[PDB]
Each structure stands twice: as C-alpha cells, then as structure tokens.
Design a protein around this ligand. Structure first.
Ligand SMILES: [Mg+2]
Ligand SMILES: [Mg+2]
Ligand SMILES: [Mg+2]
Lengths: 236, 56, 109, 199, 51
RNA sequence: CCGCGGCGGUGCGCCGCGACCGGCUCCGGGACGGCUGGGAAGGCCCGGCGGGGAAGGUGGCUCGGCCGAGUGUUACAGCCCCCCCGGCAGCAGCACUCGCCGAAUCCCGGGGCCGAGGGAGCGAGACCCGUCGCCGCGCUCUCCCCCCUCCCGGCGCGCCGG
RNA sequence: CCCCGGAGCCCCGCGGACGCUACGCCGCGACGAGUAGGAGGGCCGCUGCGGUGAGCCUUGAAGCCUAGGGCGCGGGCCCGGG
RNA sequence: GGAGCCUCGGUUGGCCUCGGAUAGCCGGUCCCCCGCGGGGUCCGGUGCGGAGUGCCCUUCGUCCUGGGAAACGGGGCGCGGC
C-alpha cells in the first residue's frame, strides 16, 4: 500500500506525466498474464414438528404508501461536514491572542489554543484572568490580534475535543403536557472533569502569559470602539 | 462601419471566445460545445474533430 | 462593556436620479471616504435597529420593544467611500438619515 | 454630536453646499457668525444681485410673495434651503437640524467651532479677486442690527481674550510642571514616545 | 447540460482538450525553474557586491 | 419500549456555519516574448577631439564679516555640459515603478457578492444503487530500499520493531 | 462454452413506467412593444333546453353583507361567519 | 420612593483667543510705556504647524490580600457662604 508515486504540483496536476509514471510505477515487468430455483439464497433457521422452517431475512413490507418521491441524480461532489477540509486564517497561530466578537464573552480578550476537528477554535482567556473558560469559537467571529504568547510546549489534554465541548441535555417523551417537563432541569452544571481540565491547562499558560509585562492586565480588559477610532484605520 | 467595431484577433482571443462562449449550431439549436462529440458529429466530415481543431 | 460596532448612516436607496431601487441600501460608514478605505467593511453584518410599540422576543433575553432588520455590506459604492448594503428585508425609508450598525463579525482580520 | 461652524471666512454657497449634505445625513449643525460669511465677486455686483431678488414679488399681493430676509443668518439659511428638497417631509426635517445665527450667541460663544476649509475664502479664491462681506450686503439691503451685532461681539472678543489668557497660563504651568516632575514620569514619558507621540 | 467554463474548470478543459494537462504541467515547472534561476542571479549579485 | 441503527421525505418559529459547483467583481504573487534583437540610465574608468554655458578665475561696482554674498565682461578647464572617435561584465520594459505592446510567448494563490432548482428504481427467495465521459493519479495483485515517525509492542525523554 | 420464472441488473431484443386523460406525458433550442385590424384558447361569466351527477337543500336553497382563509397572469372562483 | 401605558432618537467627552495668509505661534524680557495684567522694542525657540482636531481629555470587567512606585486625593444627587 505505497503512497503517491507522483507528488502534487498543483491541485489536479501531478508533477510527473503519464510516461514518467509508467517507468516509476514500472508497468514493464508488472504485466499480468491472466487468460435461485432450488438452492435458496439467504434465509434459514431451525424448529420442531413438520421439520425445519425457511425464514426470510428482510421480509417484504406490510404497507405501501399511496405515492412516494422518486430518487435523485447522484451529484458528484457534495461531502458531509465531517469529510470537509478545514481552513484557518494565517493570522491565527497557536498561543496568539483573539478578541471574541459575538457571544456573552463579547469583546473579552483571549488566548487561542488549537483548531479542533470541527474547524472551530479551542480557546481560553485563562478563566482566572478574564472569566473565559476552555471554550470553542469560530474563526469568523474573532479578531486575530497581532500579539502572541509563546505556547509551544504546553501539553493540552488529548481527551479534550469537539466531542467533549458539546451540549448535552433533553430526551423525547416524559409527562410533557401541563406546566412541567424540561422547562426546569434549570442549570448547566459545570462538572468536576471540566474544572480539572481548566486547572491543568491554565497553569501551563498562566506562567507563560505573565512573563510578558502587562499582558495579564491586557487580558483582563475588554475591547470596544470609542470615538474617533475606526476599525479600518487601526490594526490588530 | 459606424455600426461595428472590428479588427484582427489574437491567438488568445480565438481561444477565449471559443472556450468561454463557444456554441454550436446543431440542428438549428444553439448548443454549448460541452464535448467534441458535438463538434465531430457536425464538422468531422472536414477533419475537424475537437475544439482544438476548430480553433486552428 | 462598550460599543462593538462601527457607526454608519443610511444614505438612502441605490437609485438612479428618477428610479429608486429600494432593495439596495447605501451606507455612509463613519470615518471612511475612499473606495480604498472600504475593503475592511465588505461582507460585514449590519443592523437597522429600531423599537416599536408591541413587545417582541429576544435571542438569549426576555421580551423587548427593540427590533432589527439584518443585512450585509456587499460592495463599495462610488469613490468617496459610500458602501452598498442589502438587507433581509428592504429598509423602511423612515430610516433615512438614521443609524445602522456595521458590525465587525464576519471578520477576515 | 453637533457641528458648530464659524461662518466667518467662508463662501456663502460653498459653505451652504457642504452644510446641506451634513444636514441631510441627520447631522445637527449650527452655523455662527453668519454676517462674516463672504461672497465672491465685487461688492456692487452682489448688491444688485440681491436688489433684483427684492424686486421679485407677487404683483397682486406682495404679502404672499417671496419673503426677502435681510439678516445674514436668514440669508444663509435661505441659500441652504435652496439645496435641500425642502418641500418634502425629509427636507423640512433636514432644515430643522440647521441653526443659524448673526453673530455668536451664548450656547456657542463657549464652544470650539470648526471651519470648513473647502468653503474658505483664503483657499477657494484667487487673492486678486474681489468679494463682499455678507454683513455690508445685509446692512445696505435693510438689515437693522449690524451695529448691535458689532457691539455685542466686541464684548465677546474681550470676554474671550480673558479666557485665552487663563488658558495660556495653565498651559505654561503644565509645561513647567512636566519639567519639575521629569524624573518621576520618565519611564512613562519614554513609552509614550516608542509608540510615537511626544516627538 | 450546464456549461462549466473550461478556462476556470481544469477538468472540463482537459475533457475538451487533453493536451492542456501537459501545457500547464510545463509552465508551472518552467516558471519555477526560471524563478529559482533569478534567485541564483540575485545571490551572485549580492556576493559580487560583498566582494 | 430503547435504539435518533439503515432509507425516505420534514424542519413550529427565528438563526448561524461549513465545504462543492455556476456566474461575477476585485486583490496579491510570481514566469515569459517582441522592439532602434527596445530608448535612456547606472557603475568602472582610460586615451584622445573639438564647441557651449559660464568658473576654484579675473575685473568694474555694490552689500556684509583677506573671506563670504550680489551683478558685469573675455572665455581656457582646475563647476559642468555637448558632439566626435574605442570598450568593459549589470543588465532585465528594471521596486531607483523615467516613457510600450502583448501571452499556446501564462501560471499560482486569495478575498466580496448573487445563485443552487434538475431529479436515467413502484420485482416476485438474491442492492432500496450505483453512476456516464475526463483527470490522472493513488494503490494493489512486482520486488527493493530509505526516512520520518501516529497507534500498538519491545528495549535503554532516547533507540528499535502502522 | 448450459436455462433470466432467475444475468441480478447502466442494458437486458423473455415482460414491461411511479409515466400512457396519446386532445396525455416528456426533452432540447429560440424568442415575448402594439392602435386599427385579424385568429386561437378560456376547468371565464349569464339565462333556458336533452343528457348525466343513487348531486346539494328546512340539520337551511337563491340572493345579500363581510378589517375571516385561499386559489388563479386574468376573466373569475372556492371555502369560514353573518 | 413603587408600579405603568405611550413616543422615540441615541450607544464617551472636548469648558471658547483674535486673526493672518507676499505670514503666523510661543516664550522671556535685561529695558521702556500703560491699566496681577495690556502695548512696545530687543533677544531665544517652533513653523508642511507635537503648546498638532493627522489633536486633546477620559477608560472599558467585580472583588479578595500584601508588596513596591505614586499618595491627601475622592466621595456622601454630603451640607452653608462669596
Ligand atoms: Mg405581444
Ligand atoms: Mg384591438
Ligand atoms: Mg438600546
């Protein structure tokens, strides 16, 4: 199961050729000179008197609807989200600083930790400083400030992934009708694993941030546009 | 003259016009030259069997 | 704790002299006056934000009297840093010469 | 949130043009010292031009007909009114933002007031060209209150000269203060000139 | 059939004219080759300036 | 009933993302051709040959402290310029953007916008589905080796064995 | 080198739509100003007749009115309430 | 101090010389004149204006404790007089 014997030159253009590839792959020397009725297909079981019984796995249906929709047309190149390729603004590098633009943690400043599987950012404005925990964000609702901490050698937990940072509650039936059922439940509880994860990560960062003078105080502060200062003019 | 602009096209011009806006007349139906099977079917009796031949 | 949106005035609709094409707002973004200063603002979310008699809902909030019409700055309109917008509904005309908020948050920065 | 523009040294229509668009974009504007607005073209030229405008009246009942305002403030208002769609609701709303004054009265006599340099005489005219003060013009066409407006402005300039002297006095002490303190603001003052002020 | 524009859509170009592949394989390589050779001139000019 | 397993149509209401294609409008990079086989330029300097403005000059006068500044004349070169012979690699339509025309002599990457509009499965003991053309490749049914090393296994973070 | 009452199917000539009111259904192109005027189609509309709806109707017909719900490009139409 | 219809716009402030433009701004006067200032001369600084609206002022998380530099500043819609 060898890798790709020609590399990529451009998306869709291999470096080599047809002819170089014939020689590389060596098509010379790799020449392959090669010149129901009664028996039931897929049923079968056991059983007592009379003899054995022939069942039928996947038995034809007990209701047809009166009309139903008729197929589609194959359509070529339409991958599900999981199989997508993930981008990242070059500005956003690990241990950089963001300004989170949208949520409740709005205008708050933050440190960027990693791009998760999803394509979301993982983020921490060390809970301690900012009041921003280990948290997902989107590239698109974040301003990649030109300010970096050196975060190279911090072992972020392998177990913290997209799958963990994912909302949890609510199933279907229960009592339902009346003045009850899951309008209560009430609170997302923080849990202890979550608190342990934070504790571990922050300690590795937290010394690193402090080394930079005033940086903690910067990371405490909140961003906002005052008079006379225009996004397009200033830099971050 | 005062109804047209005209002159001597480049090589690139003949390509860009043919590839981007090359439409056959095929049973009097303007049809886009999506494959050479179209060009050939019509012009193949002249030795013209592909977009490239057409351009030449 | 402060303002996370750049100010802009609703100039009026994209229009010829004598045919206004109501489906496209024009937006005089504050502090920008060159078809040059305005590549920042292309494709940013923007809100006509206004309040009305009856109460409404509110995302992550209790029922309010404020309402908004969301839109998007599409392209730069003529030399002096006006900008075209397009809104999920057309803007009211009541709106002329009033604030609309151009956000930061489809950022490419 | 409000423009105050010292109409002195500006050009009548040139300023009015710029004011109109500000006013149409919801900007509340105030235009002050309107008698000081000055109009290109030699004096006599413009007097006749006004006197013509006076002649325009509704023959059968002048009481209806085009009301020729004398005061420089109202004149300037008239010319700004000529660049808005003032028959519309939005046009009428626009003018309601604009606020014009002969001389400079009490809210704005202690406000810093801007200057539109694109309407300014020193820039927009050749120096050998002639022009008219809209005051003189207003005076001769019947404006009653030139002298009053002059006598009130001499007070204001005297009142202001005092303020400036005290302002200067603070500035001077502040220049002294920094020098008194410049070893215990030294590693602040250094950082405010790495990122490029104080130079 | 939808007309995919050959000049943007590589594989449509190839469908209509397969010799494109080679023509474009050349003129990536060719341009890289020459770009390298420009850096090499520039390095020799800097070395000549240092000498 | 729990499986939200497999397929099919759906979303109560308001939202957002993602990647793919179409049509646009921009941005940034690079690589080439042709010319008066570009014109000017730069850099190194050497040997000559004249002509001009006008000079470290001189001179009348003036203005300042022999020196500096301002006019005026004959004009060599000790400020330059110009022509003519003869010769060097650094040029290159040159980021020292001084003046073009282009691209089988042309490619790469990026951003904003609008749009998705169609539906080659209605079998009774064996798919509720692929896919046509094109790209190549990639792989394998051929052996080799090298490297890195993710999982796992072993040995001392280092080394050895998908 | 064998038979589809079974090759398992991208093509199948052994039998054939979910589709086929053949005045139906489906696909590709192109095009679309209009007086006078002409022609076509109107499951547009009015009143009466032969047929036909085992139609509807005092458990409420026709008409009338309706800031009720919809359909149709439109002529118009259908439902809710009074 | 409490509720409760309605109408909306807003989403840091700027508390000021006069003016000139083939000129201005600031200092300081050793010296002189006028009513701490005003006017003068002289000198010293700036002048594509940094005593700059290309500007200035203001900060934008809350608290805890326990050091340093800075330190008598702030408040009680604190209270009376000029
Ligand atoms: Mg017609
Ligand atoms: Mg007719
Ligand atoms: Mg509000």
């Amino acid at each position: 199961p060898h890798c790709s014997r020609n590399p990529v030159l451009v998306r869709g253009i291999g470096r080599y050729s047809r002819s170089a590839m014939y020689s590389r792959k060596a098509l010379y020397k790799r020449k392959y000179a090669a010149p129901v009725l009664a028996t039931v297909t897929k049923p079968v079981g056991g059983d007592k008197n009379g003899g054995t019984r022939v069942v039928k796995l996947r038995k034809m249906p007990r209701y047809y609807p009166t009309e139903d929709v008729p197929r589609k047309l194959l359509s070529h190149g339409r991958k599900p989200f999981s199989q997508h390729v993930r981008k990242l603004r070059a500005s956003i590098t690990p241990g950089t600083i963001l300004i989170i633009l949208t949520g409740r943690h709005r205008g708050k400043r933050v440190v960027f930790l990693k791009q998760l599987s999803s394509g979301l950012l993982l983020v921490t404005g060390p809970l301690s400083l900012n009041r921003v925990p280990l948290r997902r964000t989107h590239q698109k609702f974040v301003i990649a400030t030109s300010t970096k901490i050196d975060i190279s050698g911090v072992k972020i937990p392998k177990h913290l992934t997209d799958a963990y940072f994912k909302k949890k509650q609510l199933r279907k039936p229960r009592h339902q009708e009346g003045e009850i059922f899951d309008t209560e439940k009430e609170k997302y509880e923080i849990t202890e694993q979550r608190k342990v994860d934070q504790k571990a990560v922050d300690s590795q960062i937290l010394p690193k941030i402090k080394a930079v003078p005033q940086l903690q105080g910067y990371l405490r502060s909140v961003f906002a546009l005052t008079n006379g200062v225009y996004p397009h003019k200033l830099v971050f | 003259e005062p109804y047209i602009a005209w002159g001597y096209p480049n090589l690139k011009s003949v390509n860009e016009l043919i590839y981007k806006r090359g439409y056959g007349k095929i049973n009097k139906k303007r049809i886009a030259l999506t494959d050479n099977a179209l060009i050939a079917r019509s012009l193949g009796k002249y030795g013209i069997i592909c977009m490239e031949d057409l351009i030449h | 704790s402060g303002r996370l949106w750049c100010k802009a005035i609703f100039a009026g609709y994209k229009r010829g002299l004598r045919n206004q094409r109501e489906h496209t707002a024009l937006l005089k973004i504050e502090g920008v006056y060159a078809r040059d200063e305005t590549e920042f603002y292309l494709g940013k979310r923007c809100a006509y934000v206004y309040k009305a008699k009856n109460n409404t809902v509110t995302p992550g909030g209790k029922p309010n009297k404020t309402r908004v019409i969301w839109g998007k700055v599409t392209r730069a309109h003529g030399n002096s840093g006006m900008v075209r917008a397009k809104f999920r509904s057309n803007l009211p005309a009541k709106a002329i010469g009033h604030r609309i908020r151009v956000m930061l948050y489809p950022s490419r920065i | 949130q409000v423009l105050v523009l010292d109409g002195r040294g500006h050009l009548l229509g040139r300023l009015a043009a710029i004011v109109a668009k500000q006013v149409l974009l919801g900007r509340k504007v105030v235009v002050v010292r309107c008698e000081g607005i000055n109009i290109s073209g030699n004096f006599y030229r413009n007097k006749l031009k006004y006197l013509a405008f006076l002649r325009k009246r509704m023959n059968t009942n002048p009481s209806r007909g085009p009301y020729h305002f004398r005061a420089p403030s109202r004149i300037f208002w008239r010319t700004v009114r000529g660049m808005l769609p003032h028959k519309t609701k939005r046009g009428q709303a626009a003018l309601d933002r604009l606020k014009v004054f002969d001389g400079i009265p009490p809210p704005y006599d202690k406000k810093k007031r801007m200057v539109v340099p694109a309407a300014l005489k020193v820039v927009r005219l050749k120096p050998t060209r002639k022009f008219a003060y809209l005051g003189r013009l207003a005076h001769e066409v019947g404006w009653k209150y030139q002298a009053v407006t002059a006598t009130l402005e001499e007070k204001r300039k005297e009142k202001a000269k005092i303020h400036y002297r005290k302002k200067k006095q603070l500035m001077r002490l502040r220049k002294q203060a920094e020098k008194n303190v410049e070893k215990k603001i030294d590693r602040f003052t250094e950082v405010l000139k790495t990122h490029g002020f104080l130079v | 059939v939808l007309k995919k524009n050959p000049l943007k859509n590589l594989r449509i170009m190839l469908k209509l004219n397969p010799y494109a592949k080679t023509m474009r394989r050349n003129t990536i390589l060719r341009q890289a080759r020459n770009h390298k050779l420009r850096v090499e001139r520039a390095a020799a000019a800097l070395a000549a300036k240092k000498s």
